[PDB]
Amino acid sequence: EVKILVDRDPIKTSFEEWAKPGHFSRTIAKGPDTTTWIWNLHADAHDFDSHTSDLEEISRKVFSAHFGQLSIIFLWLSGMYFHGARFSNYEAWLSDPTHIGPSAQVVWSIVGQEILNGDVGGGFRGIQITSGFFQIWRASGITSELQLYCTAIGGLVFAALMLFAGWFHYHKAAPKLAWFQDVESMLNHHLAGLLGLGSLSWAGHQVHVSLPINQFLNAGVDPKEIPLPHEFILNRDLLAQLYPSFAEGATPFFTLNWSKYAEFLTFRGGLDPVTGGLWLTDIAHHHLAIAILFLIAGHMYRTNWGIGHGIKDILEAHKGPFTGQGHKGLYEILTTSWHAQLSINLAMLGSLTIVVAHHMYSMPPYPYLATDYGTQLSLFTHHMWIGGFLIVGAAAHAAIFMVRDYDPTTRYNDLLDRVLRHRDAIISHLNWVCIFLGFHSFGLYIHNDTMSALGRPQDMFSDTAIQLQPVFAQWIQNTHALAPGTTAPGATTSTSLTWGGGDLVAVGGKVALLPIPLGTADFLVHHIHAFTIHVTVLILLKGVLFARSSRLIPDKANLGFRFPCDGPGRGGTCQVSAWDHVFLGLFWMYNAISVVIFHFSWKMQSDVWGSISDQGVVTHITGGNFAQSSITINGWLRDFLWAQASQVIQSYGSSLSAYGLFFLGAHFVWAFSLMFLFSGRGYWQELIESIVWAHNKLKVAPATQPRALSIVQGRAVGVTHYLLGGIATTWAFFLARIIAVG
Amino acid sequence: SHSVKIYDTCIGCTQCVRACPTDVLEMIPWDGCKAKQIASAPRTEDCVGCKRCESACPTDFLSVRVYLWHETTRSMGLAY
Amino acid sequence: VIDEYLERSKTNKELNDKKRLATSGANFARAFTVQFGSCKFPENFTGC
Amino acid sequence: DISGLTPCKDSKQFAKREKQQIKKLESSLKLYAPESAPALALNAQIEKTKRRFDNYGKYGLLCGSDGLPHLIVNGDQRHWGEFITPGILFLYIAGWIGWVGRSYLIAISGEKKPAMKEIIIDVPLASRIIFRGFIWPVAAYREFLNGDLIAK
Amino acid sequence: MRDLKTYLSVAPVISTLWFAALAGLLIEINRLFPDALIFPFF
Ligand code: CLA
Ligand code: CLA
């Protein structure tokens, strides 16, 4: 049954294992013969599945690593809060949020870097931050710095607690294998306890603390005159003056006449005119409903009592038209190996992050967030990159599982075998789809370029010559615009202002949100996005499916997961492992994310963001040139890359100069990556031979004989440098432009 | 068909014969070593060129050498 | 919001910007304290 | 004086550049209150700029037509401090480092497994070896004369 | 104590200590003498 099972003092804490490096692997622990040993010592550090074979030790190591990661995260949060408390202009920004730029870092005065202390505003000099922490603090109700200091101290305490917990659970009382293999209890506790209770407590905080303070702030009261948050709890008269429903107490809740709470639990939707964000009452209502839903859903699986559901029974008793017996042995596979769970969770987290970025840019949930353009751009790009990286890692872990943890004798599944028995058709169809999509999507642009270069503007695919309009998206937009009139009588207005139809919202002379039009350019860019996504999916799926064996190599599983090749024979067998497939798909993920962020940036600058005069006219940043210049590659190169790079290259001698320096440095790194992607090991080894001879002549020969990097190491270095350089270039360009112009 | 050659520095450890994926090499009795055997490559036409035999050979330089040569259906690893 | 706190803010509108400016100046000078002259090598012990 | 260059105290573009820098600093200085710390920091910056320009004028460098100082690496006795003396200092430091490293390598070469000594340095031996680099030129010259510098 | 001292003598720890000391000394030297383009002592 469900029980607590632990082992007492499995390991003894001592420094004897710190002295000798590479104690986990005997081959590494033997000693360094050449330099390659060092490069191995860091590669196999976290491969717990290769150190031993028992599941118990692997699970304990995973638990301790999770605790350490939590401690590091808590330390980072405490540091951020302390910086916000001490070196910041939060109190000055609180009174005048529109005319003051947030800043939470101060640079020293050693070399001459004091030029980096720009005039952000409010009698302060420092670096303007784009993390969006000030909006979070304002929405939480913080109006002083003592609270931030207390939060930092609490974060430090919690980080220390997490570190101690990790040490205790590895070296003092380590749970047994049966403890980890209880998925029903874990699911119940994660659904009902971790998610429902936390959201319920946050809803309670919002009801009791955030709403009154934010109402006082929105009224126009000075932040230094607002009553302290505990005064609202202590004094019921203040809350009665603010919200009369509280005068009735908690009696309505048990009386089921919940309408009395309609004052601070509303369903209006839309954006708040004063701050350009969502209503806080709607947020509290949503959190309460989510808490109820999670608390109800957390009691589904049978643990220690008669009532409940069994996951294995649900999987086995599943019957359907296309499935059949299907999911019979999936429970053992999922409860036996960590890699399948890691892949599933990685893919889900990446998809959730992308959805989070979309929902966050579409409907701003924080006050004074829509009118701060740099924060929005940074959040969108950062979340998109994180989601892409996680989605990439999921496939690599799936391939690792398929390579080293799959055996069809002891643990056999029908669906996996059926999929593995017809992989050729899947690969062929995906290849054809990718070819067709790429041909059409890029041929449209090439045709537009050629027709425009020949003095034939009437033959292009544009809104004036040959129109390809997204009719389905326009229909969906119209339906969403007309939704609250008849389909959703509860809501006063639509969920978002993006849908075509409604009014414009602007805060403090700057546009917050307005409906986004859709035309031929959106059609073309959407098809390009689909093409890139399909190619990445094709690469990753081909890597995953052909991991065990192939027509060219019938015994690829014996060589392992990380091997360079099989030999010069068969015409050439370079890059046949799944690791090479992941290393190749990284490039396409980078390409797709870069295209997506470029599209988002240009469209938002051209059609949404801008300024409003007193008369009522709206002037956008780039004056709406997206619909006519983004249909050709020359337009993308000239009106986006050339025009918007004026700020970054002219930032020398100002407070933004650092960005400009990065705009150069990243470039260098990118070029450096090419050295590791175009060459091979033999040339470098032969050069190191002569260098070693020259060293030997002067009696400076080291015992550890120098060796050139392995092929896999070179590929990893090249791809890492490429990605870092590209991402840093985009980061510097985006930040410089959006800070200098917005 | 590629060309596989064996030199007299071989010590008869039988690693190359075990490493071959297409059954090209075998062992024959010999006279000039402690192991009293030496490798040979009769089935040369079945060689693909993977060079696993060279990968598994303890010597200052390999006693088994593979030189790529005229390609055919068998040496190209084609199943269609 | 009851217009009494608004009247309090209007009455005490002055010296509030002064307090904000003083806090911002202290936050900035927390990095230049040594270059200013105060908080020199003596009295750094349990100071600043 | 040399290659059509003007002494940096005589040149007018130097003073013009100083004026532009001072004006640029004062433009930002005018914003903040006189008692505020940013005003003190900007005043310190202005004083530092003035001192730097005065020192550059004093040291006798030669600005060009554009008004920026130029360096002479000919070996002319009037400009030995620009290149030659820092070069000698750098050569001394680099020789010290190289001699110390080579001495440590030779010292640890005796043991059975020097690799474990390379990956895990021993501190007492290195501390003893380090201070012998203060006299590296003499030791190197004597070893070259004897014939112990070059392996055979 | 022996094992802790042995660990403290490993390459990355010694490297980071040496480089931190060197960086601190260089920063302090540049602070005491703000700007330097030629060697003026002679
Ligand atoms: C990749 C996509 C692509 C596409 C779709 C087009 C499309 C077009 N181009 Mg452009 N072009 C492209 C790329 C592309 N171009 C490139 C890369 C270049 C080189 C730079 C050019 C250069 C170019 C020039 C120089 C010219 C054009 C022009 C044109 C038009 C001429 C069409 C025509 O006469 O032949 C169409 C011929 C066919 C035989 C159609 C075949 C497709 C059929 C419909 C298959 C559909 C399959 C079906 C579903 C099968 C199902 C089977 C089932 C029933 C069982 C057309 C709108 C011409 C123009 O003036 O137009 C205004 C022109 O002079 N193009
Ligand atoms: C209702 C109680 C409960 C709660 C709150 C949690 C919460 C959590 N568990 Mg789960 N878990 C539970 C029951 C619970 N568990 C049970 C009964 C089992 C056994 C089947 C597991 C098995 C389990 C494993 C194997 C792992 C987790 C992990 C995690 C953490 C996920 C990290 C994260 O998402 O950041 C959310 C971050 C925060 C909310 C941090 C707040 C700190 C919390 C509140 C600590 C108190 C929690 C603890 C259950 C209560 C203390 C008991 C002890 C004092 C006697 C999170 C702290 C993962 C982890 O990260 O490991 C450390 C992990 O590897 N859980």
Ligand code: CLA
């Ligand atoms: C969610 C967390 C997560 C976890 C726990 C794991 C866990 C694991 N991974 Mg997976 N992986 C993930 C996500 C994750 N992965 C993602 C998102 C990707 C896509 C990139 C991958 C792709 C991947 C590959 C390609 C491989 C693994 C492998 C492994 C194993 C070895 C780990 C290792 O030795 O690294 C220890 C740490 C390092 C070697 C550090 C390398 C330095 C990094 C790359 C630099 C990043 C630099 C920084 C961001 C920039 C600042 C520069 C500054 C420092 C100057 C380990 C079981 C390896 C394996 O052998 O599996 C059997 C393997 O080959 N993973």
Ligand code: CLA
């Ligand atoms: C910008 C240069 C570039 C280009 C154009 C391509 C092109 C392509 N890549 Mg490659 N690739 C590149 C760089 C490039 N790659 C780099 C840097 C890497 C990293 C190593 C890769 C790695 C890579 C991988 C891992 C994969 C590909 C695949 C593909 C194909 C995708 C399918 C498709 O879209 O075809 C449609 C055609 C095009 C988009 C090419 C341009 C054609 C235009 C429209 C002209 C047509 C005009 C006309 C017919 C010309 C006639 C004139 C003549 C008579 C004189 C396609 C051939 C994928 C694949 O092959 O699967 C199908 C795949 O899996 N590539």
Ligand SMILES: CC1=C(/C=C/C(C)=C/C=C/C(C)=C/C=C/C=C(C)/C=C/C=C(C)/C=C/C2=C(C)CCCC2(C)C)C(C)(C)CCC1
């Ligand atoms: C921010 C932050 C922080 C803090 C935090 C906090 C401060 C928290 C809190 C929290 C809390 C404060 C929570 C609470 C919770 C609560 C709960 C969860 C409750 C519940 C309840 C219930 C469940 C009830 C029930 C019932 C009913 C239904 C009816 C009648 C009867 C009874 C009453 C039983 C820290 C520093 C750490 C870190 C960093 C960040």
Ligand SMILES: CC1=C(/C=C/C(C)=C/C=C/C(C)=C/C=C/C=C(C)/C=C/C=C(C)/C=C/C2=C(C)CCCC2(C)C)C(C)(C)CCC1
């Ligand atoms: C996304 C993300 C993030 C964030 C996060 C967060 C924000 C979280 C939160 C979380 C939370 C917010 C949580 C919460 C929790 C809670 C809990 C866990 C509770 C509990 C409770 C209890 C246990 C109670 C009890 C009791 C009492 C006291 C009274 C009555 C009776 C009873 C028994 C019921 C970051 C940034 C980091 C980054 C990464 C990612």
Ligand SMILES: CC1=C(C/C=C(\C)CCC[C@H](C)CCC[C@H](C)CCCC(C)C)C(=O)c2ccccc2C1=O
């Ligand atoms: C440049 C290059 C090399 C040569 C790269 C080498 C040798 C890496 C050198 C790394 C560092 C710089 C060596 C020294 C590391 C020590 C930590 C130095 C200690 C001394 C002080 C700096 C502290 C390859 O070996 C290679 C192999 C396969 C494909 C491509 C390539 C490739 O492109």
